[PDB]
């Protein structure tokens, strides 16, 4: 008759009445995003989202969440990428991310598109998700920088990539974290994230308060002394950065 909440270190959670084995299995289980307000509510099996409908957590009473479903028939399911498939719904945006960021021309000279905040937020705020296909460090390291513009290390075994043509928002917009540009004085960091649709990925989290329409940047963190193993635009920027220092 009790309700359990299981928080990941990133601040998202699963919440529901667990079954006899103590598992998050039922028709009224929910994933709640780190705002503690946006939720995906519905059928889960042992914590895996089978059919989560978009909802708002309106209140909690005696620990029990009370949700209101959002209009539309916005449904989501566990859909972890493979080495060759990025998403079964590449054009279906994440509903939490879509309230917080948008893509526009970067303010950084010659840097293409960038990722911007839609609203003012405080420090430590998860803004965007970095999802992609899952490939090995051997594949990435053994190949040309021209092909490695979007590669993000996930852990010691996996690199997340957004290969052509999925680097265009008209072909892939389920997540947008690959759109953040590099800065040596960034306002955001990459952090681990466990996502109910994307699985184990990284997110973009603010280090400080950010205003609406501010460009979000992260330090790409290439090895500076393996000179730097990095693209030339970064090597140039590193020298300039080191100079002002």
């Amino acid at each position: 008759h009790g309700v359990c909440w299981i928080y990941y270190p990133d601040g998202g959670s699963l919440v529901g009445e667990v079954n006899e084995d103590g598992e998050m299995t039922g028709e009224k289980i929910a994933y709640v995003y780190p705002d503690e307000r946006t939720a995906l509510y519905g059928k889960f099996i042992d914590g895996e989202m089978i059919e989560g409908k978009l909802a708002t957590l309106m209140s909690t009473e005696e620990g029990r969440p009370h949700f209101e479903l959002m209009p539309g028939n916005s449904v989501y399911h566990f859909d972890k990428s493979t080495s060759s498939c990025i998403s079964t719904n590449a054009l279906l945006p994440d509903p939490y991310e879509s309230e917080r960021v948008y893509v526009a021309e970067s303010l950084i000279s010659s840097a293409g598109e960038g990722l911007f905040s839609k609203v003012a937020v405080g420090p430590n705020t998860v803004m965007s998700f970095a999802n992609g296909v899952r490939i090995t460090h051997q594949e990435v390291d053994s190949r040309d920088w021209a092909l490695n513009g979007n590669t993000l290390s996930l852990d010691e075994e996996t690199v997340i990539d957004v290969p052509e043509p999925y680097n265009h928002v008209s072909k892939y917009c389920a997540s947008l974290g690959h759109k953040a540009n590099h800065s040596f004085t960034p306002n955001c960091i990459y952090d681990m994230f466990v996502h109910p649709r994307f699985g184990p990925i990284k997110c973009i989290r603010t280090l400080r308060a950010v205003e609406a329409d501010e460009e979000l940047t992260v330090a790409y963190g290439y090895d500076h002394s393996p000179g730097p193993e990095a693209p030339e635009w970064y090597q140039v920027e590193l020298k300039a950065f080191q100079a002002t220092q």
Binding site: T151, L152, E156, Y190
Partner: peptide, 8 residues
């Protein structure tokens, strides 16, 4: 490595 954010 030719990827972002590796733990060295």
């Amino acid at each position: 490595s030719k990827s972002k954010d590796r733990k060295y």
